[PDB]
Design an enzyme around this catalytic site. Structure first.
Site, mmCIF file in Angstrom:
data_model
loop_
_atom_site.group_PDB
_atom_site.id
_atom_site.type_symbol
_atom_site.label_atom_id
_atom_site.label_comp_id
_atom_site.label_asym_id
_atom_site.label_seq_id
_atom_site.Cartn_x
_atom_site.Cartn_y
_atom_site.Cartn_z
ATOM 1 N NE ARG A 1 -1.742 -8.343 -2.589
ATOM 2 C CZ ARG A 1 -2.080 -7.217 -3.221
ATOM 3 N NH1 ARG A 1 -3.176 -7.153 -3.972
ATOM 4 N NH2 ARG A 1 -1.321 -6.141 -3.088
ATOM 5 C CG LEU B 1 13.043 4.541 -13.468
ATOM 6 C CD1 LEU B 1 14.402 4.336 -12.785
ATOM 7 C CD2 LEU B 1 12.408 3.195 -13.800
ATOM 8 C CD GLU C 1 1.879 -4.079 -8.624
ATOM 9 O OE1 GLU C 1 2.464 -3.045 -8.222
ATOM 10 O OE2 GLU C 1 0.869 -4.554 -8.034
ATOM 11 N N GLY D 1 0.794 -1.235 0.000
ATOM 12 C CA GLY D 1 0.000 0.000 0.000
ATOM 13 C C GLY D 1 0.823 1.280 0.000
HETATM 14 N N1 LIG Z 1 2.509 -7.116 1.972
HETATM 15 C C1 LIG Z 1 1.455 -6.529 2.581
HETATM 16 N N2 LIG Z 1 1.266 -6.609 3.925
HETATM 17 C C2 LIG Z 1 0.205 -6.014 4.514
HETATM 18 N N3 LIG Z 1 -0.738 -5.304 3.829
HETATM 19 C C3 LIG Z 1 -0.665 -5.147 2.481
HETATM 20 C C4 LIG Z 1 0.462 -5.770 1.770
HETATM 21 N N4 LIG Z 1 0.298 -5.481 0.468
HETATM 22 C C5 LIG Z 1 -0.819 -4.732 0.346
HETATM 23 N N5 LIG Z 1 -1.394 -4.523 1.545
HETATM 24 C C6 LIG Z 1 -2.657 -3.787 1.787
HETATM 25 O O1 LIG Z 1 -3.724 -4.309 0.969
HETATM 26 C C7 LIG Z 1 -4.571 -3.260 0.513
HETATM 27 C C8 LIG Z 1 -4.520 -3.210 -1.009
HETATM 28 O O2 LIG Z 1 -3.189 -2.988 -1.485
HETATM 29 P P1 LIG Z 1 -2.904 -1.849 -2.594
HETATM 30 O O3 LIG Z 1 -1.418 -1.691 -2.805
HETATM 31 O O4 LIG Z 1 -3.708 -0.626 -2.199
HETATM 32 O O5 LIG Z 1 -3.615 -2.525 -3.882
HETATM 33 P P2 LIG Z 1 -3.011 -3.498 -5.020
HETATM 34 O O6 LIG Z 1 -1.597 -3.863 -4.658
HETATM 35 O O7 LIG Z 1 -3.932 -4.693 -5.010
HETATM 36 O O8 LIG Z 1 -3.167 -2.613 -6.236
HETATM 37 C C9 LIG Z 1 -4.040 -1.980 1.147
HETATM 38 O O9 LIG Z 1 -4.769 -1.721 2.359
HETATM 39 C C10 LIG Z 1 -2.579 -2.308 1.450
HETATM 40 O O10 LIG Z 1 -2.000 -1.552 2.526
HETATM 41 N N1 LIG Z 2 12.119 2.741 -8.404
HETATM 42 C C1 LIG Z 2 11.043 3.550 -8.489
HETATM 43 N N2 LIG Z 2 11.076 4.741 -9.133
HETATM 44 C C2 LIG Z 2 9.989 5.552 -9.219
HETATM 45 N N3 LIG Z 2 8.791 5.231 -8.670
HETATM 46 C C3 LIG Z 2 8.626 4.048 -8.011
HETATM 47 C C4 LIG Z 2 9.762 3.126 -7.880
HETATM 48 N N4 LIG Z 2 9.334 2.045 -7.193
HETATM 49 C C5 LIG Z 2 8.033 2.268 -6.897
HETATM 50 N N5 LIG Z 2 7.611 3.457 -7.382
HETATM 51 C C6 LIG Z 2 6.230 4.019 -7.296
HETATM 52 O O1 LIG Z 2 5.615 3.682 -6.049
HETATM 53 C C7 LIG Z 2 4.512 2.790 -6.239
HETATM 54 C C8 LIG Z 2 4.544 1.762 -5.122
HETATM 55 O O2 LIG Z 2 5.730 0.977 -5.238
HETATM 56 P P1 LIG Z 2 5.642 -0.619 -5.133
HETATM 57 O O3 LIG Z 2 7.044 -1.154 -5.294
HETATM 58 O O4 LIG Z 2 4.602 -1.170 -6.086
HETATM 59 O O5 LIG Z 2 5.167 -0.770 -3.586
HETATM 60 P P2 LIG Z 2 3.882 -1.477 -2.904
HETATM 61 O O6 LIG Z 2 4.333 -2.903 -2.547
HETATM 62 O O7 LIG Z 2 3.689 -0.664 -1.656
HETATM 63 O O8 LIG Z 2 2.750 -1.429 -3.910
HETATM 64 C C9 LIG Z 2 4.698 2.218 -7.639
HETATM 65 O O9 LIG Z 2 3.452 1.889 -8.252
HETATM 66 C C10 LIG Z 2 5.413 3.329 -8.389
HETATM 67 O O10 LIG Z 2 4.472 4.235 -8.984
HETATM 68 CA CA LIG Z 3 2.955 -7.291 -2.765
HETATM 69 CA CA LIG Z 4 2.616 -2.176 -6.068
#
Ligand SMILES: Nc1ncnc2c1ncn2[C@@H]1O[C@H](COP(=O)(O)OP(=O)(O)O)[C@@H](O)[C@H]1O
Ligand SMILES: Nc1ncnc2c1ncn2[C@@H]1O[C@H](COP(=O)(O)OP(=O)(O)O)[C@@H](O)[C@H]1O
Ligand SMILES: [Ca+2]
Ligand SMILES: [Ca+2]
Ligand SMILES: Nc1ncnc2c1ncn2[C@@H]1O[C@H](COP(=O)(O)OP(=O)(O)O)[C@@H](O)[C@H]1O
Ligand SMILES: Nc1ncnc2c1ncn2[C@@H]1O[C@H](COP(=O)(O)OP(=O)(O)O)[C@@H](O)[C@H]1O
Ligand SMILES: [Ca+2]
Ligand SMILES: [Ca+2]
Ligand SMILES: [Cl-]
Ligand SMILES: [Cl-]
Ligand SMILES: [Cl-]
Lengths: 444, 446
Positions: A292, A204, A276, A165
């Protein structure tokens, strides 16, 4: 088909899962905290088990309570939804060892691909481009940390290996901020996820967030279900998602989709999942695999006709993939607006009683929420209370549809981000399409 | 082309039209009665005009007021929805004469096909099989009327030429009930439709109601959009509709669809419309053409992807059809349950204030209604307050979705037929498909 399942989640996704179950004639067990007794899906479920008091740590993350709930009700499987224990390999293991089917990937695949440091290592090994980074966990040696930063080039981002999140992420522009950023991110990640492992990644400047939906049966068949663009973000969390991704040509779609399907087969992936990417200058760079169901899975459903939750359930029952790649067709366009119980401007949580509610309706409008007039949004959980998804024959129609639906949507008694979603739909650059991941916070 | 239109209707259909206008950038004028100030579409409209007090005859049938509303707001077109004045040739004429676009067919087409006696004649002329019947209005000569019933064979049915919604129809089992059945249907038709013209038709014992959706541009292009089965009925009025119709083979679909499209071209039909048939023993028998949008149009929208309201507006603006026949593709299945403010057992109207409302949702679930919590359903109008439509990859999935969605639908404060719709969806014979037009009343004991 699975006789009975525990839905080990809450809110909109628990209701989404309950509906799919009902269509397939699968009996439902709703496990809930004492704060969630009046959840729409709890009231609709065949059986309900209270698994603890309000805090998540005591209920939705309570592994032995959830597994015991499956035993007491004679359920055969557990669907973890998203968040909570869905990417928790320990939970997956314990579910199987108590004799239940875990609706998701094998526990070893969750360890492989769920943990973000080892997922990057795995993808690099597979020949899948990733973002330059520490390629491993950061230690406590600040000279070594500075040296990694210098090698990849400022700016950088410190990222939690167990992060979700957008929590446990901090951008660092230079040496002066590096130590306190690594220290703060560790503390946040330890608090939120009970895992203080962080890594470093190159920040990035101009990418889009583009992700590919996959489905694999664990038997060696895998398909991709087009892509989604989720570039509108605040605090590194998605706010708007759409499918397909604007400007992605059929040739490019099949290129990246085939790589993801092949990656699934190679690692022995099972169930639904998402790869992603950051998409910049025509290239995709892997950042995360969610092992998931995705929050934003409805946009993919709308443009493919595939019910992703039903597919999850079929796969968990040991059914092989029904759909071949050639049978997957993108038709039209869908946009999803997340509805969150928070101030539309300061973004501070707004729990409490919804005094008036009206969902939008009409051709091409899909409303995904447990909320109702009289329902109390608790303070204990994530702010996302609903999802509005609009489908059209093209992107112009989908956005027009969303604009109107957001005007019909009434949620009174608490603060919401509905007016923010209205502003995004009216944004000239969103309308153009292909805005980068930094755009929304720039605009705001 | 259409920058402002009057929505000459109310309730769910008015809202349906409004949504299409909003999506197309078309400014809306909501005309309403004094009892309908708080209708959802009225509140959402760009402009609102009160066209009379509560009774329909004094408001939604008030031709001078509706045209004045169009005049004063500078509207270019009027959508009549369904019911009311939508099949009123005098209204269409007057709208056109007053310099507005009537979103519907030409007035001559409404009198050719809207009137049920002439429609049968026209279809017979065109060599389309109809149900055997009087082939003209019934007079007062009972020896002649009995002679007709002899030719076609009891049971027969007395039908109002201006009839709609199942009103002005009586089944006649023998000579002993004939004369009073005629007199009573005349009276009922006179009071409800300002038209006492009645005809006689053979009463078919085992048919299904299968109808074909058409679109024609009035420039020579005409297409059919598969069909709908609407056999679940009470008092000769539809309760559940679905698309496509089970057990209609491709050869039968093209046979009948092509005939209906040809009929459109031949009469110079313009806009949306539906040819309604009785289907028995593999044969279609024409009964009615609706020269207007159907209530149950959403089931066809869900299986074809075609927005029928938007098409009406496009056609009304002078644009050719947006699609050729070879482009029409049926995918999946859709079922619609009408939702009515009425006793689920006796079917007595149940007006009043809705104290609690919750709409179903999910993949494939479409809810079409103006109702909301605190909304008062007035006593003045038709009992239908909403439509629940469920789409699925196949008929079983659509039905299973409807079961789930019905369990979620909460409407408290007034009686509804939600409990009836639940029973129908749980009916094993319905689940198999192909039940006839008499089945529901058989099931209920009516
Ligand atoms: N590894 C994790 N551990 C705990 N909570 C998580 C984890 N990954 C995602 N969440 C939670 O699950 C919900 C959906 O995740 P989000 O990043 O918003 O959507 P998605 O990854 O499905 O696009 C959010 O409340 C987020 O904080
Ligand atoms: N290396 C990066 N450079 C720029 N933006 C990033 C990078 N990594 C993540 N982000 C931005 O932050 C968002 C959340 O990062 P992500 O790795 O998907 O974390 P989460 O597990 O919380 O979803 C990404 O969808 C992207 O838009
Ligand atoms: Ca994840
Ligand atoms: Ca993500
Ligand atoms: N010719 C007509 N005159 C007046 N009202 C009509 C006429 N035809 C239909 N209606 C009314 O319009 C509404 C919808 O008609 P109905 O027969 O239920 O739907 P459809 O014919 O679209 O399947 C009902 O309230 C019905 O009484
Ligand atoms: N000749 C007939 N024999 C048997 N049933 C009929 C006949 N005509 C009509 N019905 C039944 O009555 C319903 C209403 O008749 P219809 O002519 O469509 O009148 P309306 O204009 O009220 O819609 C039909 O849908 C059909 O099921
Ligand atoms: Ca009819
Ligand atoms: Ca009619
Ligand atoms: Cl909540
Ligand atoms: Cl309305
Ligand atoms: Cl009403």
């Amino acid at each position: 088909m699975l006789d009975k399942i525990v839905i080990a989640n809450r809110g909109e996704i628990a209701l989404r899962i309950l509906r799919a179950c009902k269509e397939l004639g699968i009996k439902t067990v709703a496990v809930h905290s004492s704060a969630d007794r009046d959840l729409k899906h709890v009231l609709l479920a065949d059986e309900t088990v209270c698994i603890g008091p309000a805090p998540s740590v005591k209920s939705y993350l309570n592994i032995p309570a959830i597994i015991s709930a499956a035993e007491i009700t004679g359920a055969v499987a557990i669907h973890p939804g998203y968040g909570f224990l869905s990417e928790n390999a320990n939970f997956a293991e314990q579910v199987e060892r108590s004799g239940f089917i875990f609706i998701g990937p094998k526990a070893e695949t969750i360890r492989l691909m769920g943990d973000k440091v080892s997922a990057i290592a795995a993808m690099k090994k597979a020949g899948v481009p990733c973002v330059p980074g520490s390629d491993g966990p950061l230690g406590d040696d600040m000279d070594k940390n500075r040296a990694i930063a210098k090698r990849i080039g400022y700016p950088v981002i410190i990222k939690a290996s167990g992060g979700g999140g957008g929590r446990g992420m901090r951008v660092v522009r230079g040496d002066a901020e590096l130590a306190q950023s690594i220290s703060m991110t560790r503390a946040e990640a330890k608090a939120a996820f009970s895992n203080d492992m962080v890594y470093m990644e190159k920040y990035l400047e101009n990418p889009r967030h583009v992700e590919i939906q996959v489905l694999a049966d664990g038997q060696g068949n895998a398909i991709y279900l087009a892509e989604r663009d989720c570039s509108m973000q605040r605090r590194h969390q998605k706010v708007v998602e759409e499918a397909p991704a604007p400007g992605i040509t059929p040739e490019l779609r099949r290129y990246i989709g085939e790589r993801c399907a092949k990656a699934c087969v190679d690692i022995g992936y099972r169930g639904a999942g998402t790869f992603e990417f950051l998409f910049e200058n025509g290239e995709f760079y892997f950042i995360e695999m969610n092992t998931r169901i995705q929050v934003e899975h409805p946009v993919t459903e709308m443009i493919t006709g595939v019910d992703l939750i039903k597919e999850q359930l079929r796969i968990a029952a040991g059914q092989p993939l029904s759909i071949k790649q050639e049978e997957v067709h993108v038709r039209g366009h869908a946009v999803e607006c997340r509805i969150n119980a928070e101030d539309p401007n300061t973004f501070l949580p707004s729990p409490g009683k919804i005094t008036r509610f009206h969902a939008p309706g009409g051709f091409g409008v899909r409303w995904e929420s447990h909320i109702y007039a009289g329902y109390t949004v608790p303070p204990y959980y994530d702010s996302m209370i609903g999802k509005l998804i609009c489908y059209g024959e093209n992107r112009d129609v989908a956005i027009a549809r969303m604009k109107n639906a957001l005007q019909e949507l009434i949620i009174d008694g608490i603060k919401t981000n509905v007016d923010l979603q209205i502003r995004i739909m009216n944004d000239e650059n969103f309308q153009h399409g292909g805005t980068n991941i930094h755009y929304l916070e720039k605009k705001l």
